[PDB]
Amino acid sequence: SNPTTFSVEAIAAYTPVALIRLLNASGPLQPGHRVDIADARSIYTVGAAASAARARANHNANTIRRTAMFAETDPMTWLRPTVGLRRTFNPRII
Amino acid sequence: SNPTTFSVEAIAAYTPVALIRLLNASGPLQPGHRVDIADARSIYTVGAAASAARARANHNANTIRRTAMFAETDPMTWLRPTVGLRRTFNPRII
Amino acid sequence: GDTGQAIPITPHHDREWGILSKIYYYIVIPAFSRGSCCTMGVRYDRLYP
Amino acid sequence: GLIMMAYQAYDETIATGTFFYPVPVNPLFACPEHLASLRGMTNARRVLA
Amino acid sequence: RGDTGQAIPITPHHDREWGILSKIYYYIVIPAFSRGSCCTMGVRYDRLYPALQAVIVPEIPADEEAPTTPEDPRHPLHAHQLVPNSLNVYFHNAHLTV
């Protein structure tokens, strides 16, 4: 978090990027300044995806561990089934 | 129950097998260890059958004992044969 | 399986995949579209973000 | 045993190696599609006969 | 209607009608307006005869009724008993209750 210090775009920027619902990209820019650019693009998304996967963090008091969905052994298989999911229910805990 | 002491699978294992909510078969195994194996499967049998045969105990506070299923003698039958149920009534004793 | 690195590639589906896919794409699609449908490639770099 | 019409094997909800096996048996049915049994070998039995 | 003994005895079970009409769709109905889908095999008997478990619900709740309609969380066919291992999440790939 500190210091990088905060993505202003600019081309610093920093890899995480631990925000969510960011009305920042647009937002003003305004526009991008005089630097090279190339990635930039990659370092943006590679962190943006994590900043939503980490943005979940919670909602896991409402999930639901995943399961095998599909599966494979499952080191026993010999006295007990192995099959998994298709996820067409709803996980919500109320 | 004690001591056998607890089925870890392993190939001990023990005949009943007097649990409910077994997150156990899997669970980890992980996998079955270095033993010959074969039964196992049947010692698993007569015990997993007990594992809910005994685990009934309750759910007779809602029943609904059986019926003669069908009828034939039926030690009287001379003024009184029968038929055993099919009881679509939704049985809960309430 | 394990995705791994040394494990070589295997078909996801058996050969009837090829036959059914070819029949579909080369008969049913042209029969309905009647030469209006077009085939294109995507811009993943502009889609995923 | 059992009988069965047509199902799904290129494949994404159900197993192998626990509770099923081929049979081609008792003659008046015609089943083109059980392409999926028993592996480690050549290319032999679906595009030679 | 049986009681113990050693061999209970020879005469026809059911006998000679139910034999020609039911097994009389074996000649009669399926693979040709079909164009032929029904495919038959014998078994070996283990993923229903040694393995089908898991034991987790609470009772059907205490001492009342049982209508139908499908909504929200407390239950067996509910994933509070459905991740994978029982019969339950197993069970709903499609759309229904228990």
From Swiss-Prot, chain D:
<comment type="subunit">
    <text>Homomultimer. Makes the hexons and eleven out of twelve pentons. Interacts with triplex proteins 1/TRX1 and 2/TRX2; adjacent capsomers are linked together in groups of three by triplexes, heterotrimeric complexes composed of one molecule of TRX1 and two molecules of TRX2. Interacts with scaffold protein; this interaction allows efficient MCP transport to the host nucleus. Interacts with capsid vertex component 2/CVC2. Interacts with the small capsomere-interacting protein/SCP.</text>
</comment>
<comment type="similarity">
    <text>Belongs to the herpesviridae major capsid protein family.</text>
</comment>
<comment type="function">
    <text>Self-assembles to form an icosahedral capsid with a T=16 symmetry, about 200 nm in diameter, and consisting of 150 hexons and 12 pentons (total of 162 capsomers). Hexons form the edges and faces of the capsid and are each composed of six MCP molecules. In contrast, one penton is found at each of the 12 vertices. Eleven of the pentons are MCP pentamers, while the last vertex is occupied by the portal complex.</text>
</comment>
<protein>
    <recommendedName>
        <fullName>Major capsid protein</fullName>
    </recommendedName>
</protein>
